[PDB]
């Protein structure tokens, strides 16, 4: 079943891919791998071919490579970017060094759309509804994105949306939950709900909600709207030093959101209050938010599916580089493409 490969050097870097992928265009580099846009003659789709060149330089790298492949092979949902293909030109484990991941390159990112257009409240309802539909699926497998922001949401002309680029580490901080920013405690799935509130708030006002400079600055901005922590939340902060820093602040009441978002759909503002709650344990879940009156036109409890269970037991495994590499190789080989 090995397809025919063709090789070419694009921008001082070698790509060896199946002939099904045509007209490769370097669309970016990084520190985690180069990316090219291409035409996938098999599906007729425009796709992103991501080459990981350095996959196994450390235990951290090898493990993160395996984690990214595991996550991506598990994602089967309309509002979540899935794996269209994964391949290596290697004919055996011994010569295995490069891994390539292929995903659908749909529309443009939300940040790009907003730069060229003022969305209506209607767009906002449907877009946010799609993010939460995707998040209910993800959270049901006990997966946390961890890095949601406009640049990680693909949107097309017909308003379809898919969540992409999951945080693989185990502007950017402007969407992060207070408790994960300073690492106050072990994170809840609702750190993604906090990012959603930040995203929606910005879509409605056309202004970034918490545009802080550093952690303290951003924390202060956050706590001014949402108020400062109480005893309940303080009991949950594991770090004694963070708790001492928290108590040193001058107390701040929560603000009323209705004065901050005047003229916005009142239901939108109500959902915002439920998403942007300081205590993570009290933030609305994605399943609950889908049931919120703001999405009345779009809610269908018979079509907001959950995921199969995702085995994260590997996270606690303590293995050698070659063992993580071998597990990764096995996952490439076992990959079954989507219809």
């Amino acid at each position: 079943e090995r397809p025919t490969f063709y090789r070419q050097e694009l921008n001082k870097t070698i790509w060896e891919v199946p002939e099904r992928y045509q007209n490769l265009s370097p669309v970016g580099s990084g520190a985690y791998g180069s990316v090219c846009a291409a035409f996938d003659t098999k599906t007729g789709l425009r796709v992103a071919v991501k080459k990981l060149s350095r996959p196994f330089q450390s235990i951290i790298h090898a493990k993160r490579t395996y984690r990214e492949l595991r996550l991506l092979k598990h994602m089967k949902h309309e509002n979540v970017i899935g794996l269209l293909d994964v391949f290596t030109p290697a004919r055996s484990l011994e010569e295995f060094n490069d891994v390539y991941l292929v995903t659908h390159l749909m529309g443009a990112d939300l940040n790009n759309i907003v730069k060229c257009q003022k969305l209506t409240d209607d767009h906002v309802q449907f877009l946010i509804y799609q993010i939460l539909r995707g998040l209910k699926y993800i959270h049901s497998a006990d997966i946390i994105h961890r890095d949601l922001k406009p640049s990680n949401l693909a949107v097309n002309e017909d308003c379809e949306l898919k969540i992409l680029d999951f945080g693989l580490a185990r502007a950017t901080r402007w969407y992060r939950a207070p408790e994960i920013m300073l690492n106050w405690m072990h994170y809840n799935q609702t750190v993604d709900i906090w990012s959603v509130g930040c995203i929606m708030a910005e879509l409605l006002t056309g202004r970034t909600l918490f545009p802080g400079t550093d952690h303290i600055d951003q924390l202060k901005l956050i706590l001014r709207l949402v108020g400062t922590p109480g005893a309940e939340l303080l009991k949950k902060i594991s770090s004694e030093s963070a708790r001492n820093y928290i108590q040193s602040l001058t107390q701040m009441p929560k603000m009323n959101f209705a004065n901050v978002f005047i003229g916005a759909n009142p239901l939108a503002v109500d959902l915002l209050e439920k998403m942007l709650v300081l205590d993570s344990d009290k933030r609305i879940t994605a399943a609950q938010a889908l049931a919120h009156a703001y999405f009345a036109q779009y809610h269908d409890p018979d079509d907001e599916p959950v995921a199969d269970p995702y085995d994260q037991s590997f996270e606690s495994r303590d293995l050698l580089i070659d063992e993580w590499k071998s597990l990764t190789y096995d996952e490439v080989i076992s990959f079954v493409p989507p219809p």
Binding site: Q117, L119, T120, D122, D158, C159, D300, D303
Partner: peptide, 24 residues
């Protein structure tokens, strides 16, 4: 890209939601 008006947009999800909204 420019996003069409939701009224003009057509996709599988919207199609589905519009089909339920009539079976009602």
């Amino acid at each position: 890209i420019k996003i069409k008006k939701i009224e003009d947009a057509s996709n599988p999800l919207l199609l589905k939601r519009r089909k339920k909204a009539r079976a009602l």
